[PDB]
Design a protein around this ligand. Structure first.
Ligand code: CA
Ligand code: CA
Ligand code: CA
Ligand code: CA
Lengths: 220, 219
């Protein structure tokens, strides 16, 4: 000591709309969730609503019975505008609060569960990279369930704070996951190395004083 | 899975195993990647053309107008698309909200943002040239295709619609429509002959056929 830090590394992302990124989807054999999520992909309506956008993508992909939207009647879908129609949802965290400060991993899980949907919240501190990779890759091969991640953007080479978005696929050959980034005005979907995504989840959110992590969602 | 309307059997939904395989076995699918990145729900039942335009303009990376919530970032949205006099001079947003837009108006609205637009009424071409020219575009980055067609002629409810095309599957001779009415229907793979018939219908507003538009950067 002191540590001289001779070798330092920065995370390498592959964009979905790159030639390589396209190839990673086509060579993935853990990509069932990509198709329904792609059908539902939305832009977060404000710079704090990443979790709401992520939730409604998953609820619509699961075919969860949705609130009315007068503009679409008789058709009904979850939107960021109607997601808080259920008072139990507002009781977790109110929309005006989310619009200022976002949501924590535990709030994300509780907001989903307020609609009676099955959830399993995994803080990084309570699991490990090997179980994350294995369990998420399995979910990505399975219909009827989805995965949402909460991670510090800085640790995957983006700016900057905590973010939430669904995962859509896992490329086995490169050990990368595809993040369907709902901040569509800022970044494309990206393929991130498991080790970098793990590092980014294994950070402490000062709002919760707990680590970030990932949530499994399925229909009951 | 999502609660959209049951499709007529001549259509293969993107929301089906076969529909996924048609993307995986397509050799004309480059446009799917950027278009999927930009896919949006039309904000009302008249705004299909606006949703389609913004998907394409965002996919092309055009400098975009100011937004209500994303500053300093900018993207085309259904709320900011009409934020200049040149675009509004084509057709007023108040009218698009009640009547939609014709094929010619679609073209002019796109062109008001400075990009290169070619409008093809079905009457002025033929099915073989439609298939070849569109499949070629679908392999090429930096350009896109939007169709205007009568939904009933492909089995769907009901009137004239507008949405982008994302891919062409050679074995089945089907095009993938990225249907912006996401609350009602999934994206669908439609036989070329059905899509051709649906474009070769007379829009009562224009007394011209429907058709398709090619869009690329002017630069
Ligand atoms: Ca490519
Ligand atoms: Ca499946
Ligand atoms: Ca799954
Ligand atoms: Ca193209």
């Amino acid at each position: 000591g002191p540590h001289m830090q001779t070798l330092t590394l920065s995370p390498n992302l592959i964009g979905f709309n790159s030639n390589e990124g396209e190839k990673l989807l086509l060579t993935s054999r853990s990509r069932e969730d990509f198709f329904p999520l792609s059908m539902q992909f939305v832009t977060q309506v404000n710079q704090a609503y990443c979790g709401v956008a992520s939730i409604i993508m998953v609820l619509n992909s699961l075919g969860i019975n949705a609130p009315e939207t007068a503009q679409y009647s008789p058709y009904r879908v979850f939107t960021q505008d109607n997601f808080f129609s259920n008072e139990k949802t507002k009781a977790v965290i109110a929309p005006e609060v989310v619009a200022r400060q976002g949501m924590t991993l535990d709030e994300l899980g509780r907001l989903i569960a307020s609609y009676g949907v099955k959830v399993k919240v995994n803080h990084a501190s309570d699991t490990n990279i090997e179980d994350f990779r294995k369990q998420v890759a399995e979910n990505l091969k399975q219909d009827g369930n989805f995965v949402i991640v909460n991670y510090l953007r800085k640790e995957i080479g983006q700016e900057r704070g905590g973010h939430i978005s669904p995962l859509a696929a896992y490329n086995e050959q490169t050990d990368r996951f595809l993040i369907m980034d709902v901040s569509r005005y800022k970044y494309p979907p990206v393929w991130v190395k498991t080790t970098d995504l793990w590092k980014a989840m294994n950070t402490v959110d000062s709002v919760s004083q707990k680590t970030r992590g990932f949530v499994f969602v399925s229909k009951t």
